[PDB]
Design an enzyme around this catalytic site. Structure first.
Site, mmCIF file in Angstrom:
data_model
loop_
_atom_site.group_PDB
_atom_site.id
_atom_site.type_symbol
_atom_site.label_atom_id
_atom_site.label_comp_id
_atom_site.label_asym_id
_atom_site.label_seq_id
_atom_site.Cartn_x
_atom_site.Cartn_y
_atom_site.Cartn_z
ATOM 1 N N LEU A 115 0.815 -1.211 0.000
ATOM 2 C CA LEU A 115 0.000 0.000 0.000
ATOM 3 C C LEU A 115 0.855 1.269 0.000
ATOM 4 O O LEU A 115 0.442 2.288 -0.548
ATOM 5 C CB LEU A 115 -1.012 -0.019 1.154
ATOM 6 C CG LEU A 115 -2.038 -1.161 1.129
ATOM 7 C CD1 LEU A 115 -2.711 -1.318 2.476
ATOM 8 C CD2 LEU A 115 -3.064 -0.973 0.020
ATOM 9 N N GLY A 116 2.058 1.165 0.559
ATOM 10 C CA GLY A 116 3.018 2.252 0.627
ATOM 11 C C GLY A 116 4.182 1.979 1.554
ATOM 12 O O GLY A 116 4.214 0.969 2.265
ATOM 13 N N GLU A 117 5.155 2.886 1.536
ATOM 14 C CA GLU A 117 6.361 2.794 2.358
ATOM 15 C C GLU A 117 6.540 4.048 3.199
ATOM 16 O O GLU A 117 6.144 5.139 2.780
ATOM 17 C CB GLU A 117 7.604 2.578 1.474
ATOM 18 C CG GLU A 117 7.699 1.197 0.854
ATOM 19 C CD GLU A 117 8.968 0.954 0.061
ATOM 20 O OE1 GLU A 117 9.040 1.413 -1.102
ATOM 21 O OE2 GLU A 117 9.890 0.301 0.600
ATOM 22 N N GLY B 61 9.987 0.273 7.896
ATOM 23 C CA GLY B 61 9.164 -0.825 7.396
ATOM 24 C C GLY B 61 8.361 -0.542 6.139
ATOM 25 O O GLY B 61 8.745 0.287 5.306
ATOM 26 N N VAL C 37 3.856 -0.848 4.626
ATOM 27 C CA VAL C 37 2.429 -1.061 4.896
ATOM 28 C C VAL C 37 1.872 -1.976 3.785
ATOM 29 O O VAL C 37 1.977 -1.655 2.595
ATOM 30 C CB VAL C 37 1.589 0.239 5.093
ATOM 31 C CG1 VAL C 37 0.109 -0.082 5.351
ATOM 32 C CG2 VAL C 37 2.146 1.087 6.231
ATOM 33 N N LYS D 100 1.199 -2.760 9.076
ATOM 34 C CA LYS D 100 2.535 -2.171 9.037
ATOM 35 C C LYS D 100 3.489 -3.223 9.585
ATOM 36 O O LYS D 100 3.321 -3.660 10.722
ATOM 37 C CB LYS D 100 2.606 -0.877 9.863
ATOM 38 C CG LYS D 100 3.819 -0.035 9.498
ATOM 39 C CD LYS D 100 4.084 1.065 10.505
ATOM 40 C CE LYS D 100 5.234 1.921 10.038
ATOM 41 N NZ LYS D 100 5.804 2.724 11.147
ATOM 42 N N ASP E 42 4.208 14.949 9.748
ATOM 43 C CA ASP E 42 4.412 14.545 8.346
ATOM 44 C C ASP E 42 3.097 14.549 7.583
ATOM 45 O O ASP E 42 2.781 13.613 6.835
ATOM 46 C CB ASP E 42 5.191 13.203 8.218
ATOM 47 C CG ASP E 42 5.885 12.962 6.871
ATOM 48 O OD1 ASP E 42 6.076 13.932 6.112
ATOM 49 O OD2 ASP E 42 6.250 11.799 6.593
HETATM 50 C C1 UU6 Z 1 -7.327 -2.158 -1.918
HETATM 51 C C2 UU6 Z 1 -8.150 -0.882 -2.025
HETATM 52 C C3 UU6 Z 1 -9.360 -0.955 -1.109
HETATM 53 O O1 UU6 Z 1 -8.661 -0.815 -3.370
HETATM 54 C C4 UU6 Z 1 -7.304 0.399 -1.787
HETATM 55 C C5 UU6 Z 1 -6.157 0.586 -2.794
HETATM 56 C C6 UU6 Z 1 -5.356 1.733 -2.206
HETATM 57 N N1 UU6 Z 1 -5.537 1.566 -0.762
HETATM 58 C C7 UU6 Z 1 -4.759 2.209 0.177
HETATM 59 C C8 UU6 Z 1 -4.948 2.012 1.553
HETATM 60 C C9 UU6 Z 1 -3.956 2.532 2.380
HETATM 61 N N2 UU6 Z 1 -4.025 2.345 3.790
HETATM 62 N N3 UU6 Z 1 -5.180 1.854 4.358
HETATM 63 C C10 UU6 Z 1 -4.993 1.898 5.657
HETATM 64 C C11 UU6 Z 1 -3.708 2.406 5.990
HETATM 65 C C12 UU6 Z 1 -3.013 2.738 7.159
HETATM 66 C C13 UU6 Z 1 -1.768 3.348 7.078
HETATM 67 C C14 UU6 Z 1 -1.189 3.650 5.839
HETATM 68 C C15 UU6 Z 1 0.061 4.552 5.744
HETATM 69 C C16 UU6 Z 1 0.900 4.351 6.941
HETATM 70 N N4 UU6 Z 1 1.491 4.182 7.899
HETATM 71 C C17 UU6 Z 1 0.190 5.834 4.888
HETATM 72 C C18 UU6 Z 1 0.835 4.561 4.400
HETATM 73 C C19 UU6 Z 1 2.162 4.137 3.898
HETATM 74 C C20 UU6 Z 1 0.895 3.786 3.139
HETATM 75 C C21 UU6 Z 1 -1.853 3.289 4.668
HETATM 76 C C22 UU6 Z 1 -3.102 2.687 4.750
HETATM 77 N N5 UU6 Z 1 -2.900 3.211 1.924
HETATM 78 C C23 UU6 Z 1 -2.875 3.384 0.605
HETATM 79 N N6 UU6 Z 1 -3.736 2.928 -0.308
HETATM 80 C C24 UU6 Z 1 -6.613 0.625 -0.448
#
Ligand code: UU6
EC number: 2.7.11.1
Length: 260
Positions: free
Chosen positions: A12-14, A18, A20, A33, A119
């Protein structure tokens, strides 16, 4: 590989520490995470447990497996604010206002519990099923107020285009105006689809141009007079002269009725 009943499907990201990941059960989809190896993870877990607000990411809990730490959070199905910003355009002004009101609600909440995010940027502002904004990533979050006593920050962190200028200049500085500043850069990104400068320093021409009120230049020329007047109060060099959140809540654009 498996952790209790979880399957790593998509990154989902960095962050600074670590990664996510999107984790699927056996079929609930969550955000996890994954951190390898101490003083920082104990602090992050602690802050994550304090959080209870509609505009802050929900923390499910944590699991340890030797040197690996797992931090479970609610998946933001709508993804990030970053992907709602059209490059060189931004987004419709009513959508940017609604996201800005929700950003203010989350930041007031954090500041109210004496936590500074440090941030704030579009990759850290997520969206639920109904496009409600949720502030994520607490790996840089710290306590700036405890027992009704303010502590100054003295550590440099964040993301250069989003950091307040006092952070690069002063040995110690107040937490709240730094978070206010980053919210102003987020507002600029939502309304212009462009970041105004690489960093708020004298060696940066674009920052010098803003200080010289050359608002005939991009990204400012893309922004309507009313939100630009708000940005003129947020993006103030002297943090003691910078607008506070109670006063942002009184701003003409902040209170402007918008639709379509
Ligand atoms: C599959 C689906 C549903 O189509 C969608 C596709 C893009 N998606 C997402 C979801 C997330 N989520 N979701 C919950 C979550 C909690 C923490 C973080 C972060 C941290 N620490 C910012 C960071 C480093 C990522 C991200 C989180 N980040 C991005 N895109 C989900």
């Amino acid at each position: 590989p498996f952790v209790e009943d979880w399957d790593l499907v998509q990154t989902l990201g960095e962050g600074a520490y670590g990664e996510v990941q999107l984790a699927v059960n056996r079929e609930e989809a969550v955000a996890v995470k994954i951190v390898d190896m101490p003083e920082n993870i104990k602090k992050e877990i602690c802050i994550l447990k304090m959080l209870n607000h509609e505009n802050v990411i929900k923390f499910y809990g944590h699991r340890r497996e030797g040197n690996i730490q797992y931090l479970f959070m609610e998946l933001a199905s709508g993804g990030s604010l970053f992907d709602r910003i059209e490059p060189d355009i931004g987004m419709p002004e009513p959508d940017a206002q609604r996201f800005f009101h929700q950003l203010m609600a989350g930041v007031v909440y954090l500041h109210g519990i004496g936590i500074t995010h440090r941030d704030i940027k579009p990759h850290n502002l997520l969206l639920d099923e109904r496009d409600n904004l949720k502030i994520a990533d607490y790996s840089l979050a710290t306590v700036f107020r405890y027992n009704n006593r303010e502590r100054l920050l003295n550590k440099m962190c964040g993301t250069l285009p989003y950091v307040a200028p006092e952070l690069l200049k002063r040995r110690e500085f107040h937490a709240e105006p730094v978070d206010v500043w980053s919210c102003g850069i987020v507002l600029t990104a939502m309304l212009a689809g462009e970041l105004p400068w690489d960093q708020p320093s004298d060696s940066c021409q674009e920052y010098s141009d803003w200080k010289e009120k050359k608002t005939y230049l991009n990204p400012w020329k893309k922004i309507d007079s009313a939100p630009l007047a708000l940005l003129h109060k947020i993006l103030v060099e002297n943090p003691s002269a910078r607008i506070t959140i109670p006063d942002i809540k009184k701003d003409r654009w902040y209170n402007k009725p918008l639709k379509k």
